[PDB]
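PT: before anyone asks, these are the final sequences, not the draft ones from last week. 252 residues across everything. Please model them as a single complex and drop the result in this thread when it's through.
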Amino acid sequence: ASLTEIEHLVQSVCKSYRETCQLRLEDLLRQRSNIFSREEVTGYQRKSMWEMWERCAHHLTEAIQYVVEFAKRLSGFMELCQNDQIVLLKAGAMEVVLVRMCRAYNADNRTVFFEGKYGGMELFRALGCSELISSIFDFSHSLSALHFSEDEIALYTALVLINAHRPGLQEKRKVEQLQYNLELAFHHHLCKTHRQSILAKLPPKGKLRSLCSQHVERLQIFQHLHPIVVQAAFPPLYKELFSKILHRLLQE
Ligand SMILES: C[C@H]1C[C@H](C(=O)O)CC[C@H]1C(=O)N1CC[C@@]2(S(=O)(=O)c3ccc(F)cc3)c3ccc(C(F)(C(F)(F)F)C(F)(F)F)cc3CC[C@@H]12
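LR: through. Structure below.
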């Protein structure tokens, strides 16, 4: 690739990201004072474990749908084979949502935007997965310290998705080229903006993997106690990724 081609890739990755966010960042920043009252927090804590799990799996499904759309807009992704597109979204969709999450997090009061207002960790106490919630809030807190611009999140999340080391890849070399080009775009943009200092501070790659394993372990626990809740009231896309639908979303 040449220099005008690296810069063109930067702009298309940033444009693809802005167009595939479930929530506008302007809306998220203007809502920061709209915080759940102690009575509203108590209502969430008093909801049944299964009711909280259904709501959260539904919110994760909506966010993963926007990540599927982001992947379809990344140059090179639809040029990969269907097996590879599916391998990458199955391994990387949750990881992308985990990074995106920091836009809806407020490190000033340790709250997250959930169902119209901001609330802390204690809002998810009914889920019965305290350590997973803690890890999610800590990971968001650690990304907030980086003060990412939207362009930085866009370039980083494209790299979280386009990972050539994913087990199951048929055309490994084609994914390596796409990843190398997105790496040049990310590093070029960081070099240009005098932001290469964030490289050393980016979360290690076993951290995203650990967060994803915790999610699948806690879901197995919930599913064992409530198998009919999962079968009857969990979204089909959630069950395909974590317990088909990807083939339809990708063709569309
Ligand atoms: C804001 C939204 C839209 C943005 C955009 O695109 O604009 C991109 C980010 C996206 C987002 O942050 N999210 C999408 C849904 C949401 S959540 O908001 O429901 C929420 C629940 C629990 C929590 F700790 C914190 C938040 C979510 C849902 C369920 C789980 C579970 F693993 C867990 F942890 F609950 F167990 C699980 F297991 F339920 F799946 C984790 C998360 C973390 C990411 C969150």
